[PDB]
Enzyme design. Structure first.
Site, PDB file in Angstrom:
ATOM      1  N   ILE A  49      -1.958  -4.242   7.909  1.00  0.00           N
ATOM      2  CA  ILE A  49      -2.652  -5.169   8.817  1.00  0.00           C
ATOM      3  C   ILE A  49      -2.196  -6.626   8.595  1.00  0.00           C
ATOM      4  O   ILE A  49      -2.202  -7.433   9.519  1.00  0.00           O
ATOM      5  CB  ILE A  49      -4.194  -4.963   8.788  1.00  0.00           C
ATOM      6  N   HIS A  91      -9.713   5.867  11.040  1.00  0.00           N
ATOM      7  CA  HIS A  91      -9.223   4.544  10.642  1.00  0.00           C
ATOM      8  C   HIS A  91      -7.724   4.382  10.788  1.00  0.00           C
ATOM      9  O   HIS A  91      -7.249   3.348  11.282  1.00  0.00           O
ATOM     10  CB  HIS A  91      -9.656   4.170   9.234  1.00  0.00           C
ATOM     11  N   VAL A 127       3.831   1.729   4.926  1.00  0.00           N
ATOM     12  CA  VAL A 127       3.522   3.135   5.106  1.00  0.00           C
ATOM     13  C   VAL A 127       2.042   3.252   5.377  1.00  0.00           C
ATOM     14  O   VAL A 127       1.250   2.808   4.567  1.00  0.00           O
ATOM     15  CB  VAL A 127       3.746   3.939   3.796  1.00  0.00           C
ATOM     16  N   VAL A 128       1.688   3.871   6.501  1.00  0.00           N
ATOM     17  CA  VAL A 128       0.281   4.198   6.798  1.00  0.00           C
ATOM     18  C   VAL A 128       0.194   5.707   6.876  1.00  0.00           C
ATOM     19  O   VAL A 128       0.879   6.325   7.686  1.00  0.00           O
ATOM     20  CB  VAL A 128      -0.209   3.576   8.129  1.00  0.00           C
ATOM     21  N   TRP A 156       0.876  -1.165   0.000  1.00  0.00           N
ATOM     22  CA  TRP A 156       0.000   0.000   0.000  1.00  0.00           C
ATOM     23  C   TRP A 156       0.922   1.225   0.000  1.00  0.00           C
ATOM     24  O   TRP A 156       1.772   1.382   0.884  1.00  0.00           O
ATOM     25  CB  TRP A 156      -0.859  -0.058   1.252  1.00  0.00           C
ATOM     26  N   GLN A 159      -9.195  10.721   6.291  1.00  0.00           N
ATOM     27  CA  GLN A 159     -10.228  11.612   6.808  1.00  0.00           C
ATOM     28  C   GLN A 159     -10.921  11.093   8.058  1.00  0.00           C
ATOM     29  O   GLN A 159     -11.569  11.868   8.773  1.00  0.00           O
ATOM     30  CB  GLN A 159     -11.273  11.892   5.715  1.00  0.00           C
ATOM     31  N   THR A 160     -10.784   9.788   8.312  1.00  0.00           N
ATOM     32  CA  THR A 160     -11.491   9.122   9.415  1.00  0.00           C
ATOM     33  C   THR A 160     -10.522   8.685  10.531  1.00  0.00           C
ATOM     34  O   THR A 160      -9.302   8.780  10.373  1.00  0.00           O
ATOM     35  CB  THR A 160     -12.289   7.889   8.920  1.00  0.00           C
TER      36      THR A 160
HETATM   37  O1  TP6 Z   1      -0.151  -0.450   4.544  1.00  0.00           O
HETATM   38  C1  TP6 Z   1      -1.212   0.178   4.613  1.00  0.00           C
HETATM   39  N1  TP6 Z   1      -1.160   1.548   4.645  1.00  0.00           N
HETATM   40  C2  TP6 Z   1      -2.267   2.323   4.707  1.00  0.00           C
HETATM   41  O2  TP6 Z   1      -2.175   3.563   4.745  1.00  0.00           O
HETATM   42  C3  TP6 Z   1      -3.563   1.613   4.716  1.00  0.00           C
HETATM   43  C4  TP6 Z   1      -3.557   0.129   4.658  1.00  0.00           C
HETATM   44  N2  TP6 Z   1      -2.364  -0.517   4.603  1.00  0.00           N
HETATM   45  N3  TP6 Z   1      -4.843  -0.225   4.691  1.00  0.00           N
HETATM   46  C5  TP6 Z   1      -5.498  -1.525   4.642  1.00  0.00           C
HETATM   47  C6  TP6 Z   1      -4.681  -2.689   5.114  1.00  0.00           C
HETATM   48  O3  TP6 Z   1      -3.754  -2.499   6.171  1.00  0.00           O
HETATM   49  C7  TP6 Z   1      -5.465  -3.981   5.276  1.00  0.00           C
HETATM   50  O4  TP6 Z   1      -4.923  -4.505   4.078  1.00  0.00           O
HETATM   51  C8  TP6 Z   1      -7.007  -3.988   5.209  1.00  0.00           C
HETATM   52  O5  TP6 Z   1      -7.607  -3.319   6.342  1.00  0.00           O
HETATM   53  C9  TP6 Z   1      -7.550  -5.412   5.136  1.00  0.00           C
HETATM   54  O6  TP6 Z   1      -7.000  -6.225   6.181  1.00  0.00           O
HETATM   55  C10 TP6 Z   1      -5.536   0.912   4.740  1.00  0.00           C
HETATM   56  O7  TP6 Z   1      -6.824   0.855   4.765  1.00  0.00           O
HETATM   57  N4  TP6 Z   1      -4.832   2.052   4.758  1.00  0.00           N
HETATM   58  C11 TP6 Z   1      -5.369   3.411   4.842  1.00  0.00           C
HETATM   59  C12 TP6 Z   1      -5.262   3.785   6.300  1.00  0.00           C
HETATM   60  C13 TP6 Z   1      -5.603   4.977   6.798  1.00  0.00           C
HETATM   61  C14 TP6 Z   1      -6.209   6.014   5.966  1.00  0.00           C
HETATM   62  C15 TP6 Z   1      -7.533   5.920   5.827  1.00  0.00           C
HETATM   63  O8  TP6 Z   1      -8.245   6.895   5.029  1.00  0.00           O
HETATM   64  P1  TP6 Z   1      -9.733   7.294   5.458  1.00  0.00           P
HETATM   65  O9  TP6 Z   1      -9.642   7.544   6.932  1.00  0.00           O
HETATM   66  O10 TP6 Z   1     -10.587   6.126   5.024  1.00  0.00           O
HETATM   67  O11 TP6 Z   1      -9.970   8.570   4.660  1.00  0.00           O
END
Ligand code: TP6
Ligand code: TP6
Ligand code: TP6
Ligand code: TP6
Ligand code: TP6
Ligand code: K
Ligand code: K
Ligand code: K
Ligand code: K
Ligand code: K
Ligand code: K
Ligand code: K
Ligand code: K
Ligand code: K
Ligand code: K
Ligand code: K
Ligand code: K
Ligand code: K
Lengths: 147, 146, 147, 147, 147
Positions: D47, D76, D68-69, D14, D73-74
């Site tokens: 995750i 999350h 990288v995370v 990601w 907007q949330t």
């Molecule tokens: O390496 C990552 N980096 C990331 O930045 C990431 C990841 N992974 N996943 C999903 C991921 O970790 C899992 O694959 C998924 O939840 C299924 O298990 C995400 O949903 N994200 C996005 C996370 C946070 C931002 C969220 O944006 P909003 O709040 O939805 O606008």
């Protein structure tokens, strides 16, 4: 149905009026679902819930945790709630038993009263928690061994 | 991925969004060669981990679907904490990927925008399912054969 | 009456005065409930409470944790409190023993004094924690095996 | 001289460009340290890292977690990061193996790029994490049983 | 009398000067209490501390964890600190060994210096942590099996 579910309810007494109301809601759901008979145990505070839930999970298909934590003037609220959350989650997975969360965690007494299913309340979290406990127990029963 | 045994556990608290996440998940599974994943509904997000734990005993991957939307009290925080702690534990206890498709939003609008409806920016249910299957396949190759 | 419950108290002495006051409330509750001689162990900081509570839980029906964490200038307060919460929660469930949280977590010294059951205090968390520990022990004893 | 250490790198895809950058940094450190062929495994999201790290830990002396995370907007972001933190910490202690955290947790993409060891980046977190993994593995080898 | 306690100190190297100050403070207390030369292990970052503390706990009565985490521009500080808190709490309870927390968690370098026991510091965290480790080890020794 749910009439064969062995249900336990553990309720903290800290805010007595609200806890009595949550318990009433839980017991009414259980009664409504064919359980006039759940094991009901009172504890003093929310922190005492997980250890009693752990004991109850040895002899029951589901446990409903009830109580009310209301924010005061210090950070203490955060830690009480963290403890309950960590404890109930551990108990559920250790015992492979649903431990339903009917522990209110509010900023004000008005908010808690509004969620306890008292006469003028918007909702009843004790009732909601009991439905969740029973539904999950029934689901697990179906998923597990029978043949 | 046609040989992977997939389970999906979905909380129905917010019914419409749950249905949309589940549709995204089911579609990915089917496209990947899985027409019949085990699908289980629970009433709230809190109930997901105990059910995921049971599912992980008989499956190569579990997708957890649900929606938690902030209200007026700190309760949102504790619900999300419980789900995070539980799913993380179940995945490691069972050495099985437990993909996170549980939306955690401030608003219903945000949740809708992430549930893969016609005008949604994204489909978290589909994303979680791809994650579950890919990780299962990766684990299969890392593990013992032949 | 709790006269047959084996009570231990572990108290952090970081803030000595408030610790003293909490311990006094705890002891008075225990004595009121028929326990004149609980096991009392002092530790130097809140972080040290869980490992000692762990040991105490091997030989007691209930453990009361007492202490005071007051916020300073850095995020460090948060992590001390997190550690205590995580540790006591784990110890209670590992040992299937109530570990009552009488550890104050306040922003100010005034707040902590107001909660330590000094003469003009609004409340006594040490007394409250002890009531909880004892009530929970009595509850578990009745839930568990007896004839 | 890490030539004898068995290194695995698990990298989330990601934000692929940043992942590639982190991985390049890790591979360069590993090759400098005598390791031309570490085990490299890609996962889709952060995750997924812990369960794969757990598998890798069975057959390696160190695992480097890369990814990288970036906040959206949330809330999350918070929970993804909490999961990674809880998971990697657990895997490290269950397996008694260093699991280096090279998972960036940023508010912005610009922040993540600046930390991925690209030509104009302030730092290279992938490189840092690999140094930490290898050094810790070597340290553990010395502390543990040998002649 | 703490002269018979087997002490280990694990110290991260991130912010070398402050880490050296904490370790100096720890060593002085250990020497001042007449301990055999403590086992001292360096690691690169605070995240590496718990796995080495785990190894050290197998051969020691107490472990002092020293390090410094200073907030930056991203949420990353929070997760590094969470990991340390979770890891050290687990190691202490898994090993039934005090793992004293001398890991500073500050917003600024100034704050960390002020807490690292340098000539002009308000506090000496390395020293405080070491006293806590020793006292708790002694307490446990007395609580545990002996004549
Ligand atoms: O390496 C990552 N980096 C990331 O930045 C990431 C990841 N992974 N996943 C999903 C991921 O970790 C899992 O694959 C998924 O939840 C299924 O298990 C995400 O949903 N994200 C996005 C996370 C946070 C931002 C969220 O944006 P909003 O709040 O939805 O606008
Ligand atoms: O159900 C509860 N609900 C509660 O609201 C509660 C409880 N219990 N306990 C104590 C309790 O959970 C334990 O019995 C006690 O810690 C001993 O283990 C509390 O101290 N509280 C008060 C919690 C939060 C408010 C605190 O107010 P201040 O910040 O002190 O102004
Ligand atoms: O999937 C969900 N999504 C949810 O959004 C949810 C769920 N579930 N549950 C309850 C649920 O998870 C449990 O079933 C219940 O706690 C019984 O165990 C909730 O109470 N919620 C509401 C959570 C947060 C909003 C709270 O509103 P207030 O703060 O009360 O205004
Ligand atoms: O009961 C306590 N109560 C406390 O308030 C306390 C304790 N203990 N310890 C230290 C202690 O918990 C440990 O012994 C130490 O970490 C060694 O393991 C602290 O450092 N504190 C101080 C905690 C929080 C305030 C910090 O101030 P700054 O942010 O540094 O300005
Ligand atoms: O003792 C420390 N003290 C620290 O302050 C530290 C450490 N270690 N590590 C890394 C380290 O803990 C690990 O070695 C690394 O994650 C690999 O496992 C860090 O990244 N840091 C920096 C942490 C927080 C500051 C971050 O700055 P930004 O938010 O990136 O601006
Ligand atoms: K059961
Ligand atoms: K009611
Ligand atoms: K079945
Ligand atoms: K499985
Ligand atoms: K969809
Ligand atoms: K006991
Ligand atoms: K008092
Ligand atoms: K009984
Ligand atoms: K290993
Ligand atoms: K790079
Ligand atoms: K030991
Ligand atoms: K010093
Ligand atoms: K003894």
């Amino acid at each position: 149905d749910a009439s064969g579910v062995r249900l336990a309810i553990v309720a903290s007494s800290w805010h007595g009026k609200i806890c009595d109301a949550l318990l009433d809601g839980a017991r009414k759901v259980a009664a409504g679902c064919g359980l006039d008979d759940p094991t009901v145990v009172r504890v003093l505070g929310a922190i005492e819930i997980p250890v009693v839930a752990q004991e109850l999970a040895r002899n029951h298909d589901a446990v409903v945790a009830l109580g009310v934590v209301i924010r005061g003037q210090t950070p203490h609220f955060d830690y009480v709630c963290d403890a309950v959350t960590q404890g109930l989650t551990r108990v559920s997975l250790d015992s492979s038993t649903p431990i339903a969360n009917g522990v209110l965690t509010t900023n004000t007494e008005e908010q808690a009263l509004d969620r306890a299913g008292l006469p003028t309340s918007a909702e009843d979290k004790g009732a909601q928690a009991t439905v969740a406990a029973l539904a999950t127990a029934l689901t697990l029963r179906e998923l597990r061994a029978h043949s």
